[PDB]
Design an enzyme around this catalytic site. Structure first.
Site, short mmCIF file in Angstrom:
data_model
loop_
_atom_site.label_atom_id
_atom_site.label_comp_id
_atom_site.label_asym_id
_atom_site.label_seq_id
_atom_site.Cartn_x
_atom_site.Cartn_y
_atom_site.Cartn_z
N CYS A 104 38.99 33.02 19.18
CA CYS A 104 39.08 32.19 17.88
C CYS A 104 37.68 31.52 17.55
O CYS A 104 36.85 32.34 17.27
CB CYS A 104 40.19 31.27 17.90
SG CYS A 104 40.49 30.35 16.40
N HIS A 124 37.60 34.17 15.07
CA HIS A 124 38.43 33.83 13.89
C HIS A 124 37.64 34.13 12.62
O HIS A 124 36.38 33.88 12.62
CB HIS A 124 38.80 32.33 13.95
CG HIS A 124 39.85 31.98 12.96
ND1 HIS A 124 39.59 31.64 11.63
CD2 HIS A 124 41.23 32.00 13.07
CE1 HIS A 124 40.73 31.49 10.98
NE2 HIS A 124 41.74 31.68 11.84
#
Length: 186
Positions: A104, A124
């Site tokens: 992420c 992400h």
């Protein structure tokens, strides 16, 4: 038999912390949840409070680890990025040819510490520009990206794929498949 270090900082994404820890322990990996700031409870990004197994200071003395795992969460990743202790652990892991797995915004700590430059990575979506500042990596939109010893993933929704990839890398495809089936994934 294999060993994993999960570095847990304030503001970490608690799903990205817990899913890998759980799935890795299902795989028979010995996992240490190490608190960056010490042994006290850690308040994660959606206010779940996780008690670490040890401080990072302590856990660092119990290496080596087969994988060092960096959860995401923008504010947890910033704390990882700012830590000299993390820098040393990750440099040592790369030096010994050990896996480094990050999810992420967690990969932006690799950038901060100058780890794995030249690798293909994902993040992400909203962390892409930070990760790519300077062109030190090649970007991928795959949900999980593995370039040798650098293993990256995108978000909470990719955390099972990320954890299963770690399990495959450490313990092999058959163990990852055996662990997967009871989870009711698809």
């Amino acid at each position: 038999s294999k060993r994993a270090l999960v570095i847990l900082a304030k503001g970490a994404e608690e799903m990205e912390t817990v899913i890998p820890v759980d799935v890795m322990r299902r795989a028979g990996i010995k996992v240490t949840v190490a608190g960056l700031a010490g042994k006290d409870p850690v308040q994660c990004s959606r206010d779940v409070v996780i008690c670490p197994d040890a401080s990072l200071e302590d856990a660092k003395k119990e290496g080596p680890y087969d994988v060092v795992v960096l959860p995401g969460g923008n504010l947890g990743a910033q704390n990882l990025s700012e830590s000299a202790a993390v820098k040393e652990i990750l440099k040592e892991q790369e030096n010994r040819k050990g896996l480094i797995a990050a999810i992420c915004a967690g990969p932006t700590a690799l950038l901060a510490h100058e780890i794995g430059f030249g690798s293909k990575v994902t993040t992400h979506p909203l962390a892409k520009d930070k990760m790519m500042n300077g062109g030190h990596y090649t970007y991928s939109e795959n949900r999980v990206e593995k370039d040798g010893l650098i293993l990256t993933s995108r978000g909470p929704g990719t955390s099972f794929e990320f954890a299963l990839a770690i399990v495959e890398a450490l313990n092999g495809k058959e163990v990852a498949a055996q662990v997967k089936a009871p989870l009711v994934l698809k």
